[PDB]
Each structure stands twice: as C-alpha cells, then as structure tokens.
Amino acid sequence: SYIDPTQLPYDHKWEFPRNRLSFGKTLGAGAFGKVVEATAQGLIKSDAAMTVAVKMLKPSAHSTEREALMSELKVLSYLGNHENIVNLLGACTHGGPTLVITEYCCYGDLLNFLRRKRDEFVPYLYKDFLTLEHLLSFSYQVAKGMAFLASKNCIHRDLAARNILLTHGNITKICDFGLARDIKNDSNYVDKGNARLPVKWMAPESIFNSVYTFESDVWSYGIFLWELFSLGSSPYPGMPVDSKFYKMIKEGFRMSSPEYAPAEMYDIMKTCWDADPDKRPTFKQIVQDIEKQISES
C-alpha cells in the first residue's frame, strides 16, 4: 500500500442522518458486511427522495472489520468525484454503526450483466443488444477510472468484472464490495495460506511475494479484459488453482484470446501479463491505446 487510510482525514460535510434512510433489499452480502438499497429523503436539497446504496457491517463483524469500514470511508472521501468510480454521497459515523452511502448503479455488477447479456450479444434497436462498441467503451472507462486511482496512489488489489458496476448511459464505475462479498463460497477466491484470495486475477509477484503495486493492478486489468471479451466467462477455464497452476503462470503460460476480443485488445492483455512488471503498460498508456482503437473503429 502507498497510502495509510488511517492518517486520512474525514470531512464531517459527508455526515447524513440515518433516520432519513429507508432500507430496501440486500444488494450483496458477505460474512461481516452487506450492501443494501435505500431511499434517502432530504439528500437532494429540493426534498425529492433518491435511491442510494449503503455499505454497512453485520452484527457478526469484529474490531478489524470496524476499522476497515472507517478506513474505506476515509479513502472514498479522499478520492473525490470521478465519473468512472462509485461516488460517495454521505456517511453516518455517529449514533450507530458506520454507514457508507454511495450512488446507486441500476444495472449492478458488470460480471452478472455480461452473463445475462451473453446470449443476445451482437459483434456489429429497442432490444438493447450488447455490442463490441459497448465492450470497447467498458474497457476504456475502466482504464480511465484505474488511471485516476493510480494518480491518487491507490492500489485496488481486487480489480475484476465482479467489482465494476454499470449505471445509466453504459457508464461503468469501479467499486470494491470487499466485506459485502461472500468470498468463502465464491469459487473465484482460493485458500492461499490463511487468506481467501482471487488468485486467477493476481500477478505472479502478488501470489509469490504478497507485493501489490500499480503494475499488479495492470495484470488484473488484463484478466478483467479477458472476462469482458469472453462475455463473463471465468478465467483459465477448466484449470483448477493448484500447484500446476502456480508452476504454469511462473513459467509463462498465458490465456489465448477470448472469442470476441479484437487483436489490438488481446495485444493489451499480453503486455498486462508480462512477467516483468516494468514491461507492463501503465493505465494511462492503456487509455491512450483504447481511445485510438475507438476512433479508428
């Protein structure tokens, strides 16, 4: 980590009264936390109600998870607004357990969206079919959001389609479900030491040395691109995470192109998976490379 979230300040301008929230359905839940849909009255100054997403801890949570939710709130507050990041709207740190209030993204996580849209995908009307133009736009927006996070000295550590949200106008927003994900029952997380980690998305230096950098997030972005252009398929299909998997990645085995990736997008993935972190493109370089591909299209 480059930044210390605990030394980050918390602006009380974010403070929102919890009695002005009406909780609805659970959007996501893990062992210690959950994301819940809510209606916030008096969030908009004109007295119009609005839908928000609220992250909070369950009574099952410990001191570690309580500190983690406060650190998460300081980090979100520090970042500020960006179009490709889930935006903080408010919080409640007084009169009860910590509540983190963000904007609500109506289409939910990108992975589930892609899987639902898989069968009606068109490479090139009212029906709202998913096209190659959308996948290229999602690639671009995620690289833009990640370029912004890197400029703010943020290392995500869990960049994957499951941590990307989709909202109005095909706008993608990077988020981090964290504790509001059931990692114990998610097959995308594997037991590694006394941790349950997303190994198929992790750079070799993160797997073998527990090192997380700007460059290890680029590797995960390469994996994200593979999920995107395979329309939500799990990476390294038919390959379980075992000693052979670790050996193969260390030796240079890399996934072949997903079925719908343009050759120029597969070229980005190959560079994101370079064994040498210094040879990987930066998110800024990726943004410029995709912008160019979008124009030429």
Ligand SMILES: *C(C)CC1=Nc2ccc(NC(=O)Cc3ncc(Oc4ccnc5cc(OC)ccc45)cc3OC)cc2C(C)(C)O1
């Ligand atoms: C720098 C260290 C990088 C960094 N860190 C970081 C940490 C923590 C977060 N938190 C969240 O994103 C919190 C959060 N995540 C997801 C979420 O779920 C939502 C939100 C909106 N709409 C949703 C709609 C759904 O279905 C319709 C389902 C879930 C939804 C909510 C939420 O907080 C309420 C983020 C970061 C980032 C990535 C900024 O960077």
